[PDB]
Amino acid sequence: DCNRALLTRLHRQTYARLYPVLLVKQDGSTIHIRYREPRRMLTMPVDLDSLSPEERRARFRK
Amino acid sequence: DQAAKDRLKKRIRRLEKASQELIPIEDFITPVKFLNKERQRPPVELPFEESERRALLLKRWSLYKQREHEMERSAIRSLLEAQEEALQELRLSSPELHAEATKRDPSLFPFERQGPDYTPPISDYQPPEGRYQDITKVYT
Amino acid sequence: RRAAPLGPMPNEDIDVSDLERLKKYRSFDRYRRRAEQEARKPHWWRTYREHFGEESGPKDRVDIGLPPPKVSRTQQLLERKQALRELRANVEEERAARLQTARIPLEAVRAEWERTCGPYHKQRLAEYCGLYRDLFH
Amino acid sequence: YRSKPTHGIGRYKHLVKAQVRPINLGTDYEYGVLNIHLIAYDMALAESYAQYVHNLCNHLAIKVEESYAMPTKTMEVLQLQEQGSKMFLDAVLTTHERVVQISGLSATFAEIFLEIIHSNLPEGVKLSVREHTEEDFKGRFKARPELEELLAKLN
Amino acid sequence: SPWRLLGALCLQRPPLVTKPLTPLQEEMADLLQQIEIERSLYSDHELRALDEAQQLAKKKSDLAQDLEDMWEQKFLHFKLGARLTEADKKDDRTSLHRKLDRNLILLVREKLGDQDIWMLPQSDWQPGETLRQTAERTLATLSENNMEAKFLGNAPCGHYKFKFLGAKVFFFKALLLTGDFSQAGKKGHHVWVSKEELGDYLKPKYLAQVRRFLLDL
Amino acid sequence: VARKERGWGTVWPSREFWHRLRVIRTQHHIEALVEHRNGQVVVSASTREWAIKKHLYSTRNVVACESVGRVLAERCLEAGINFMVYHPTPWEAASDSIKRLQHAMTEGGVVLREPRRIYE
RNA sequence: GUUAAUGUAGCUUAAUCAAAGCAAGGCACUGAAAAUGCCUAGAUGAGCCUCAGCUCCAUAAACACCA
């Protein structure tokens, strides 16, 4: 039933063209979002979920 | 000392007596960036066979939507009948459990929920790096 | 002084309290249909029709005429549903209907109308023109 | 006329009215108004599912107090370029929230309604069913710089 | 007539991936995309692409392509996770990640002295305990793992009575938040199954009516 | 020279006429009536009738509306009624079906705008 | 296996012109609803009998049985 309210569109007169962009968070999952600038892959990063010690450890590992 | 407090309270009361309008929503208002591209749009000239196919597709979708709505309301009514039967059975059995069950739990107020995704999460996945900032507007 | 109503009041059936949970119509034409349905009922108060001649309201008119033809209701319904299904099965009819370009056999329609339901319309037109009132009274 | 039997036939003001703390009694647990929030990056998906939930409430006879939209929350994506020591803009994502407010709801009907919603929940959209509080009421309002400065100087 | 009270849990994990689209749904999705493209004004990308093409054409007789090529190459290089995790195994049915496109329920196996039943997770409670605390204790100690479950309502979900002297069983539904199942090689056998699997497996009539209050989806 | 029922003025529709055309568009059928001042039904054509039902598909649509309009036009011509009044709502007058019904009546010969009364 | 009763579509009509009216869904329009236009599917439970009767199944509340 997840595809119940998905088969829709933008219901306005003046609007830019949007594309089915595949966006990924820090989980590996993908979501389809209508967005300009039709880049196929968008990845959203993270820099604040960790603490200072964890950030320093990640920087050292990098 | 006292005069300053009196003036401060008067200003506070005057500010409180003012209006409480909401923040205008940028979604419902078209930005001025879109007023310079309307005059160049070419037409589509939709043809007859495609019009026929679109009309038939819409009719089929309407019938399918009616059928799925009927199925979904049937499911809701079956669930409601099951719940009503269970509640009546428990009321017939014992009233104290009915009284303690017809209330709401204190752990349902902060109900957070997330839907599914196009792909399952990938194990051992690490983002390279990247920070964030707020670029939203402000209104007073 | 007050006087008790001589019958049921018009808006005394619906519940005054809890109007939010009571269903409402949002359509002026729907209200119009409801109002015209109500206006035809025999109310116990003074009405427009009583003063302006409803012609004694209902009248048991004496029927001096041939019995209606005897037809099988079940067979007629079966044939009518079959005809409707065979018509709806077509696709050229659907295309004409959606394109709003479809004509009607007016002569045919008049033929079946006069065959099945023309006598009743003719009788009511005779009633309106007052033929029976002056021929048999 | 007052003395006639037909008095009050034309009365209509009792048919139309034109001029919420929770109610709990143990068994008729009809608590107060609730706010359902949809958080999404997709205008079409968010609006469509808000329309669907509004239609569901209308069919289920749940009094919809209001149906509005939270002002847009726009976030800028800054990615770290290779070799480090460089932050460059990748793209911009706009977050949108659609809110539907319901008036009354029982425990069993609430359980069924939540079951239906989370069964029909689409992709990439966050559901949040909470109580309508003062913070939620004031969230969709203007800021109070003068008031907060006055409070700061008072304290 | 002695009376017995009995509780049971309908512990349901939601799907993680969406169902495949019906061909009619795909047709409408394509048609909606087509009409949205037609009724759209312009996008900045196509605007600059057209401007660059026109200026190059006018300057030859007197980029956006590179950007889309780079985006396509990045998309091709990037590999997404496998949406299907069961068609490759076809031998592990007790895994939490068995089915990701549908909502599943957990059934455990127990062999009693007199009855060999295909029962759901089940428990008893003293009159001094409540139904919700009983369900919480049952999920905490029967599963023998640290998992988080979300409870929807205190109202009973299903009721079933049987007379031997009679007994009543209340089925209460609950939703998964996150499941960290420890000791997976234990003799106790629990499996995640769908409504079709419930219909196939559940032999008793009392337990075959769970699909009445379980949604089909 | 008959006495038209001047009057109401505060309610709608106006009852100053001799024959009035009324179009009822239900969710399944379309019906068109001509009624006298007393409310009696004079000549009616409905898509519920078998004669139109067997020759017509989708008795609710615009082609059904024009069909019933033309049938009522010929029936009125047979009955001897040439003038009627039609009082639709503002949203109904802009409808596609009833504009076609009015055009069908006009091309069939029945004219709206019932003539003014002599010595009114 | 018993009764006081019925299978008109979700609810009520009608069963001599005719199985109707209200409900329920998609598209256009607005922030959502609502209104309007264009529309979409719908039933006399089934078998024989003369042109209202006998059975089977189903629903609804009670009595024996298995749980």
Ligand SMILES: [Mg+2]
């Ligand atoms: Mg018939």
